[PDB]
Amino acid sequence: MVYSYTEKKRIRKDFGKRPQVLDVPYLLSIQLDSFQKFIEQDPEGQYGLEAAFRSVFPIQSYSGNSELQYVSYRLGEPVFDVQECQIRGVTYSAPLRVKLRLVIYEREAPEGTVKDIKEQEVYMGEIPLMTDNGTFVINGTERVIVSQLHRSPGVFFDSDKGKTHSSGKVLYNARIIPYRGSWLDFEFDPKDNLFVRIDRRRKLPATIILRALNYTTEQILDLFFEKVIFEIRDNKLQMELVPERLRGETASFDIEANGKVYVEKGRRITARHIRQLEKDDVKLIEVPVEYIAGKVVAKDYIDESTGELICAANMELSLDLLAKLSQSGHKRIETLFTNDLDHGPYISETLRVDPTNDRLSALVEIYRMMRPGEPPTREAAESLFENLFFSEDRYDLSAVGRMKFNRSLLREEIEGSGILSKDDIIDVMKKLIDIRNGKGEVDDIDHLGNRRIRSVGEMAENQFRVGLVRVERAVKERLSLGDLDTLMPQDMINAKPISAAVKEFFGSSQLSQFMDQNNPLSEITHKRRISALGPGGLTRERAGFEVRDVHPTHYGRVCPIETPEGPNIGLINSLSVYAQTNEYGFLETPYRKVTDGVVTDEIHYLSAIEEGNYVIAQANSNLDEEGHFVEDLVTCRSKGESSLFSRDQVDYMDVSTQQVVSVGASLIPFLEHDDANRALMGANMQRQAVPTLRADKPLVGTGMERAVAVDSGVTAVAKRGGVVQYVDASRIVIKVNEDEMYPGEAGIDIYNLTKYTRSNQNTCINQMPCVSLGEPVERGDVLADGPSTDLGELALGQNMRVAFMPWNGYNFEDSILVSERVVQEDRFTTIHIQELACVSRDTKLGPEEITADIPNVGEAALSKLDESGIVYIGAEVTGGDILVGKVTPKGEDVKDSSLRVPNGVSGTVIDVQVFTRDGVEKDKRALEIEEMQLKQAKKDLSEELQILEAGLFSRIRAVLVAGGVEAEKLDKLPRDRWLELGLTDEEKQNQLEQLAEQYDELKHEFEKKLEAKRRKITQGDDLAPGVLKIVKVYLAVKRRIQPGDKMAGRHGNKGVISKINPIEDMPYDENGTPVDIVLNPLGVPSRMNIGQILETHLGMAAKGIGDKINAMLKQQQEVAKLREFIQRAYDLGADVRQKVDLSTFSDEEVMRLAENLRKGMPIATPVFDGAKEAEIKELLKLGDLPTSGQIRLYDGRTGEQFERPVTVGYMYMLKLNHLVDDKMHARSTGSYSLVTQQPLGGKAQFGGQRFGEMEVWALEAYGAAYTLQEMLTVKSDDVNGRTKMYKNIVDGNHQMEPGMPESFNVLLKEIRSLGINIELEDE
Amino acid sequence: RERMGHIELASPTAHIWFLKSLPSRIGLLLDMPLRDIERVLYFESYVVI
Amino acid sequence: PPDLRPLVPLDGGRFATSDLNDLYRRVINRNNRLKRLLDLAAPDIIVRNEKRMLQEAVDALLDNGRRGRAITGSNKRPLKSLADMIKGKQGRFRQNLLGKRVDYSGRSVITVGPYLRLHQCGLPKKMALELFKPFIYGKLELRGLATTIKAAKKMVEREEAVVWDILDEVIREHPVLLNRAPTLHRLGIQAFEPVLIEGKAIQLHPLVCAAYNADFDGDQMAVHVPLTLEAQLEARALMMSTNNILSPANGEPIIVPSQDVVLGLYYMTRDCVNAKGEGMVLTGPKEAERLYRSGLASLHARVKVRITEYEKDANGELVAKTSLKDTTVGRAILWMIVPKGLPYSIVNQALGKKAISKMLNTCYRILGLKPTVIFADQIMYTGFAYAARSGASVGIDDMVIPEKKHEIISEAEAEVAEIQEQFQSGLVTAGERYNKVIDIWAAANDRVSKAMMDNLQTETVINRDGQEEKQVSFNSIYMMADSGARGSAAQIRQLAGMRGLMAKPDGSIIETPITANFREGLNVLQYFISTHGARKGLADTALKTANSGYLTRRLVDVAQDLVVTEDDCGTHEGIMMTPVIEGGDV
RNA sequence: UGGCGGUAGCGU
DNA sequence: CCACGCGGGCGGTAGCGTGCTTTTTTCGATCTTCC
DNA sequence: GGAAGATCGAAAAAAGCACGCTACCGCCCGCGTGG
Ligand SMILES: [Mg+2]
């Protein structure tokens, strides 16, 4: 298969045998798709701003015959570019211009024609746009909004686990939850009586709401209960017998009929007896009067002669009541069937408990319950009940909510109204009664089908709707009170509240967080992270054990491995590689349809609910070439259970082996040989790895580093294929091919790299070109790598030739000994960039001015300062130095408030940025920065001008040589002289003029563009109120490896550096090569990270291959032998999916590949379709290294020989962002707090360590008591004690004055500030 | 740090620690329900002296 | 008082807002408005509302949010009144009163240092310079190098050599206290005699790490410096780690050799059969060391040496007995550091972790603490050195999978198939089928583990001047397993046997087990099943930390008062004591 | 050389 | 037409509403034992 | 002979929720009157 030009440079030897049927999709698909849906026009609405506009608008002005309605909306072009927004420090936003139409209907006529129609486009705020990178730019900072995971709206029929009642009886509750509105619960009590709870208030009898729904007691009785007819006709009391109604009831009489004794008195009913009844199917059976005693009568029977009712509805029958019915003459008695288990009479008892008897009484009770302390009003109760449940604006079930509501109740109709109907409540309570009766099963909240993910678009739409109703109230009241004439619709709508709400959501929400730019994997994981926190979600501390478990439905959607350890475990997860989102919002996973025995290539996206019905095959299940399963009995998943199934009864197969793990966890090689905890925390530390100044390719990889690098925006991916024209460390110029220029276009692509830009974690973000001049490129190929990227491949750390053996106890436990050669090559040195800010705020006493001369300051310190007052670029200032000279007006000269370098900080100043408010006089360095930016813009414009002018002058030259045919005179003459050249009077002159005018138009247009760019650069930036000039200085420093630094491998091994041992003490092999890093094997057997060893072995093999290649490069061998060796190396393996053909590559391509492979051949091993040990042994045999993986090391310290062979090999190791220099802090006599006179806290504030309460407990545990008094009073907060201690220590006397702590005095004074009289007794 | 001042309230006011910290000291001493004491205190209900 | 609610001067003309100041301003405004209304004789309704809202302001000031809504501010969140920050976790009573930040303190990440004695710790030069600054100032003033404190400060920031010499003199016997952030038990904080070292990390003694429960994976130590003489004597007497030898919970020793140390001792006590130098007769451990260092013999060789054992008799005198014993050369080397009180039988074993602990306990009981500390330092040194010389390593070839295992699995499958067939025929129910499946798989797991252990323990076969013979294997993983340095039988079973029967999060055992070793590949389903238990345990610990801390705090508060005040009560009443028997075992 | 709250993350 | 001031709450005919657990108090409703 | 003491059960309120460390965001403020 044809390889891209960026891939031909280095081809990764990939193991694995399972072919891929679906390539890795766009990792950032969720965010981009959500925002595209949110910000695009939708003809059918129901998505984004269109849905909110249609739901909110129009607004009726309190029956004022005047409303305004939505017409259209448009998103304006952003004022500033993404790079411009980042540099300037403003929010990347776009205007929201909405064309609206206010109409004033004719007064005195409800249907009269509109008198005036005012239609206009109103600027209703600005909304933040999202970049291609998948991140938002708020206030000049890159923030990311994670996707929340919340319970889907609808009906959840669950139950308590049974411990609440303490008697072993469970209680079932159905909770109807809306997208917006009040929640409604129907719960069973220990007394088997239904109850209704609204918004977690005091419970009420369940029939109260039924009465409020204008349902009579007879209506409820016949709705929620079956009916039995008793006939006292023929003096036999014959009743309509249903054979299923007689199941499981002991006979209280003789039920013989038609001369057949089915079952007699004293005999419990048997299934054969019920069968005999079915065969006889007798309509009516004679009954004694005693049998119908406890049956409740559904119909409130009334005697027509007397005019009074014999018995009320739902009343238990009585012998006197039966006699009254008999003497009344009624023969058709109605009873409610009450089975002990099949049909529980809960509704009848609930109605009996209900005190309310009419709709008005029930509504009054509801009003009292919802609004305690207020007198009941019929109209008020009606309004409250209608608004609570049956109002469109208050209560609104979402489309997903309605779908879940109908699916749970098997309504079969997916579409429905947002409001809740009476039939919905009826069906919900009927299903709850069915669950109580013993049929049906309760749902599981932890099931992934009952939880949905809300992306950025949905939350943005909700916040927009909240702002819309907030401004809707204002426009409603303004239209209601004000006269509608000459009213210009701009001033009804005020954009301040909506804009404030949008800004608050995008800059201070619970889920909008600063992204971590440590390495591209970090941004990818942060953009693909799903959290359960935020509004409408769980709390960090009151989460519960059940919600932090992994459900069997998490397969293929949520990675069981990647999860932040700590209080957030379980609550935060990472999306799977192939997982995507359904339209309703539920996670879905790809699957391969299995037809007959052959697995086809068709891909179906199965959701969580529907996956539980079919039988899912296994990714690792063996498959033949035809497609059948070579094994009849294959492992499969069905109904959330893993079991063996036959060949015929399987319907779907996994798309790929790596379908389960996330993007972050999939980058761990040999993951199947690692423990879950070890792998989890190894991926966690892989997320945090600072970029080194030289990125080195990982020798052992999983193959998706290319995809991760390409999808992440750190690289510079070309948009159009072509040939490089001008390559440089700053800019790249691409001359696109003949197929890919739009008409009237230069065809020149200018890619501007970012060099040494600060990240969100004070880490370097540098871009280095990888292509060479004249190298052809195609669209999608990488042009310049970013941080931790090498040739378009993710490179978090470095390949170290490590060994596993104890070394004098320096690697006592999990501690790493690093050779001094690592420091020599600076393989782990990292650049850190810090930013300091100085604000020239304007005070009432006077403004602040940045000057060079400062009162009473050393002139030596002013040397670093310039005439403008800012430090020169490239200075080597250290701790205590001054960067910007600022003075502030004093009371009734100027006080020196100039920004100074924080103590313990040094480095080199790389750049300075200045922001100036409009009207404030520009500074000199501001002019220099503006002219530099203008020069860069003019250089780009001239890069376009040269090609455009060359084309135009070539055309005029063709015209001239066609007409004049003085080629020699033309070429000697300048092109400007060609322009003024005249010819004979025909098209030779007409077309010449028509081309000269186009040249002039092009020049004028490009001058206009230059003027626009100059205006954009020159325009002053907006600042905070009271601020005049802001100066930001960026320093940078190289941090090298020092003892105490934390270095961890990919597989999970952690630790800190113990000693920078000189290279002469390292163990050396027979060839004399140093063994570099030495680890401790003791951590291997316990913490299962065996994938280390294999990887190490594999790494060694890889290096050996590279070694061989390097040899063939050093001896100047011909291309034939190199090609043969590379082909043999690539062909190694058994049934590998990769088929690299070296013959098709040219000699130059083969030489380039060999040059790039001289430092070892990168190896790709899939997560679960990895390379077996046999392949590793064969690769080691190819490299002539021993197949056991262990060599004989010689000690360098003593020169002896180790008794046993040790394991050595090349392992990938990272550098954690846990440096030691920024963690050490020490204080002797620092500052103190104003209120407690106690030492401060934090390294940045030069504070002191906190003596915790357990420290005091331990001090009391020992017999030390003077040390406690030292910790408590003298050294912390006794100011007299502190001064006396300092003076005595200076004098040398180590004597103590106890004193009185000031914190106790503070507490005494504050308690006395209340009504308490805490004081001191004189004795 | 050890100097305090006094605010002269125009009308008497109840201390809240002795009122809301169950059991209510004011209510226990007066032998009246807490709700009645709260209603009387917050200038909405009248009490006979 | 005004200083207790200060108006912090923010950058520029802005002043930091104080909640107490806002509440007091509200109360004063309300009182002034009420006074004005009363003076003007306002209608009863207006003054009534004014009094009610004054009462609400008093509610806000005294205890915000106690009655109803808490009065908020510009932050849209409840403000802090007196009561809220008097109480609570962040309240003045338990945040700045019961535990407070102190001066002369520092913190830094730690690293292991082997060349350090039991009573010593490694302090960075910068940390020692900063922490002991007043002592250096005083010593410089006494020396006359600096006339005033300012001159001493300038000399310190200039970093001459005289300041380094003064610092070295100061630290000579000034102990410093080191502690961990989660100090749980009594041994959480201990003092050491610091020594100046390079680098930027605190070097810590390896043996005491188990006392701190602090692995060298990025943990940070906190250091405090006593000044007064009483505090220094507390450091030398009770803060000292040497005095802390027995745990206060059960009396067992707290310091215990572990990890590489014991591993080295294991390699110094295992005996081969045909090792170089077998049959040699030596006169003493010195000649054994000579032979080993010269390369003429191996540590596992079996020889006969003349040992002069010193034993304690009546009146505590030492009696020397010389005998030609049979042992290994490594044991002879180990005998060099053994003091003159222990018998030779304490060394003539395989020297496991428990053997080392028993030897240390016997040494402490017989010869006392002072020889015991030196003996512990010596055994640490010897174990580290000989573990380095051993060159023990873990490799993929060291991981031997028993040959029968696959066959066993096959038969197990056959068995389960038969049982499954019964459930197809209706002979047995689903529950009994599942129970029999679980029992069969457990039996298969036990058989596989036994076969793997038999394979690993005695795999090595060696010629001994003739026919082949068996001996305890030299496989590295078996060394770590038997010596007890790190790992257990269950972990080695998971490693080279089978993972076992995993469990669903609810607690139910999965019907099928994980039949693949960690050495070989694991399919997706088995990894997914294991993730359930992994997440279960991780979440268990995460939620366990907080409850453990709360229980510890409550227990500490309950028993804070109890101290020993008298010698003997004279009471004749006491509790009964009998061995606890639950039935079938004691 | 001015620290008070809040938010997020890290190590046990 | 700016500086003090004031009270500071969003949301809405008000009420603070949502998958923790334990302890204490209160209050209404009922069961029961006597004046 | 049917009310007052005792009980019960549900509701409502209070109280806490391990320890260190790191980073950043808001510490005014917006609407209503008197010179
Ligand atoms: Mg640790």
Author numbering:
A (entry chain I): 1 to 892, 912 to 1342
B (entry chain J): 99 to 147
C (entry chain J): 246 to 831
What's written in the study?
RfaH, a paralog of the universally conserved NusG, binds to RNA polymerases (RNAP) and ribosomes to activate expression of virulence genes. In free, autoinhibited RfaH, an α-helical KOW domain sequesters the RNAP-binding site. Upon recruitment to RNAP paused at an ops site, KOW is released and refolds into a β-barrel, which binds the ribosome. RfaH recruitment requires a 12-nucleotide (nt) operon polarity suppressor (ops) sequence, which induces RNAP pausing.
Here, we assembled an opsPEC on a fully complementary (c) scaffold harboring the ops site, an extended upstream duplex (up to 14 bps), and an RNA that could form a hybrid of up to 11 bps and elucidated its structure by cryogenic electron microscopy (cryoEM) in combination with single-particle analysis (SPA). Consistently, while in structures of hisPECs the RNA:DNA hybrid adopted a half-translocated state (RNA post-translocated, DNA pre-translocated), our opsPEC resides in the pre-translocated state. RNAP is paused at U11, and no unpaired T-DNA nucleotide is present in the i + 1 position to receive an incoming rNTP. Consistent with the exceptionally strong pausing at ops, opsPEC undergoes particularly pronounced swiveling of 5.8°; TL is unfolded and the β’ SI3 domain is in the open conformation. In opsPEC, but not in EC38, the TL β’R933 forms salt bridges with βE546 and βD549, an interaction that may stabilize the unfolded TL. Bases G2-C9 form a hairpin that rests on top of the β‘ rudder R314. The opsHP stem comprises two Watson-Crick (WC) bps (G2:C9 and C3:G8) and a Saenger XI bp (G4:A7) and is stabilized by positively charged residues of the β lobe (R201, R371, R394), β protrusion (R470, R473), and β’ rudder (K321); G1 forms the most proximal bp of the upstream DNA duplex.
